[PDB]
Amino acid sequence: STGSATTTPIDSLDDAYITPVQIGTPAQTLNLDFDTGSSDLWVFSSETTASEVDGQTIYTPSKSTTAKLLSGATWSISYGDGSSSSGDVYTDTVSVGGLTVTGQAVESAKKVSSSFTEDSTIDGLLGLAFSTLNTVSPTQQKTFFDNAKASLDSPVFTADLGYHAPGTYNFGFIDTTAYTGSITYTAVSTKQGFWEWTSTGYAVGSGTFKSTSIDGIADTGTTLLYLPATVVSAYWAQVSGAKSSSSVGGYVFPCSATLPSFTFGVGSARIVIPGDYIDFGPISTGSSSCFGGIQSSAGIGINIFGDVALKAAFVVFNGATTPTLGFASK
Fold first, then answer.
1. Comparing C-alpha atoms, which of 141, 139, 134, 178 is closest to residue 156?
2. Which end of the chain, N or C, is surrounded by fewer C-beta atoms within 10 Å?
3. Does the structural domain 5-174 have CATH classification 2.40.70.10?
4. Is 280 helix (H, G, I), strand (E, B) or coil?
C-alpha cells in the first residue's frame, strides 16, 4: 500500500503545516500537525475541556462505529516549546492520503495548554518519531507509521514541505519526480527516539564551507532551525544590524535587510536554504525588527533541523530495520 496527502502552511509565515486525516467510521476529518519529533497521535475531541476549545474541529468517538475505548490508558505530553496536552485513548481506523490503519491509538485530549487552544487551525498532532517516545501508559502505543509499515510497499515516508506553499507527505514510496539530482542518505541514531543524524557542516551565503559535525534531529513539528551558538553567530554576523535580543527571545534583524542563504551538509552533498526562508517577519505588527529563522540551540539541549531547513529539501525517512535519512535538493 501507499498514501499521499497534501500538507498546507497554517499561516503566511509557515509556522506549521496541517495535513487532513480521516478518523473513525463514518470518517471524521481533522487537520493534524505531522510531527517527526514526537510519537503521539492526539486530537481535540468531545472530551476536551470546553473552555480550551476555540475553533478546532473535534473527534467525537461516540459517533464512530469503529471507536473503542482503550480501557485504563492515559497519556500526557510536554513539548520543547513548553506546550502540553493529556487525556485518555481510543483505538479507531485512521487514514492518511488513502493509506488506512485499523486499531490505531487515537489519543483524546481532555486538557490542552493555551498555545494549542489559541491555534484554531491545528486539530491535533500525528507523531512520526520512534514509538519508544509514545507517552501512553500503562501500555505504550505505536505510531501511525509503525502500524502501517508492514503493509507499505517500502518502509518509508517522505516530507516535501513548501515555502509559502503546500507540499506533500508520502507513505510507502519515493516520488522520483519530486526532487532534483540524487538523494544522499545518512545514518540515524534512534537512541533518543528521534530521527537523529549528523550534518557534515555549513556555509553562510557564498562563504566557504566549514567541515564540522553537527548532531541534530529532523523535526517537522519545529518551525525554525536551531543550531550551536557558534554557527548561529557566524550566520547573523553577515546581516548588518542583526543582534540577539533577550527581550524578544532570539536573533532579530532589520526588516530592511537582505538575508544570506545558509547551506548545511549531508555527507558530501549540500542543501541550500535561501535567505528568504530565514525571514519570520516583524516581531510585532508594524515593527521594523524582524525575527530570524535560524536560532541558537543553547539551552534546548539538542540541535533541531526544523521546517526552515527541511522545506529546502525532499526528505526521506527510511524506517527499514536500520533506519536512515535521505536528503535531496528540489
1. 178
2. N
3. yes
4. strand
Strand partners, 6: 168
* Distance of alpha carbon 109 from alpha carbon 24, whole angstroms: 16
H or E, element range at 184:
strand 184-187
DSSP letters for 237-255? TTSTT-EEETTTTEEEEET
The residues carrying an active-site annotation are 35, 199
- Alpha carbons 225 and 311: distance in angstroms, whole number: 11
- CATH architecture designation of domain 175-330: Beta Barrel (2.40)
- Cβ neighbours around 16 below 10 Å, total: 22
The answer to whether residues 325 and 167 touch, using CB atoms and an 8 Å cutoff, is no
Helix, strand, coil percent values for the chain (each to nearest 5): 10, 45, 45
β-strand pairing of 262-266 with 269-273: antiparallel
Is the backbone of residue 326 left (phi > 0), alpha (psi -120 to 50) or beta? beta
Alpha-carbon distance of 16 to 266, in angstroms, equals 24
Question: Which residues are registered as beta bridge partners of 317?
Answer: 157, 325
Resolution in A: 1.3
Q: Whose CA is closest to 33, among 85, 111, 69?
A: 85
- All cell numbers assigned to 197: 543524524
**What's the chain's length in residues?**
330
Q: Which amino acid is at 316?
A: V
Alpha carbons 124 and 293: distance in angstroms, whole number: 24
Q: Where are the alpha helices (DSSP H) in the chain?
A: 114-117, 144-148, 229-236, 307-310
C-beta of residue 152 within 8 angstroms of C-beta of residue 1: yes
Q: Where are the domains of the chain?
A: 5-174, 175-330
CA angle 22-28-30, nearest 5°?
A: 65
From 32, 244, 36, select the one nearest 157 (Cα to Cα): 36
